[PDB]
């Protein structure tokens, strides 16, 4: 089930990495038995960092960034959205 997480930048930034496709759209993939267009995902979480402390986990699939739907998004679109805020990030994630 999707959930919303709020992350406040610390000195180590937010403390997580995102990996995913370069292109927009593409073949549907089932995540937890539900079909979605391709989703960028959390590929690493710094132990003790802001994302870790906020409950973000490696493998989390990213559905929204700062209230903007990023289903099927390009990597660049998701990077730019994560950096949109000066010190706060709100994610809608699906854990696997």
């Amino acid at each position: 089930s999707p959930r919303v997480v709020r992350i406040v930048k610390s000195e180590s930034g937010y403390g997580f990495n995102v990996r995913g496709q370069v292109s927009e759209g593409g073949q549907l993939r089932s995540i937890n038995g539900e079909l979605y267009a391709p989703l960028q995902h959390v590929s690493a979480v710094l132990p003790g960092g802001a994302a870790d402390r906020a409950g973000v986990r490696k493998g989390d699939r990213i559905l929204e960034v700062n209230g903007v739907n990023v289903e099927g998004a390009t990597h660049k679109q998701v990077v730019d959205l994560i950096r949109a805020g000066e010190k706060e990030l709100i994610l809608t994630v699906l854990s696997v």
């Binding site: 930034g13 937010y14 403390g15 997580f16 990495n17 995102v18 990996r19 995913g20 496709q21 370069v22 590929s43 994302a51 990597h75 990077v79 994560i82 950096r83 990030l89």
Partner: peptide
């Protein structure tokens, strides 16, 4: 696929 750090 591409990876970025935050």
């Amino acid at each position: 696929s591409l990876e970025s750090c935050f």
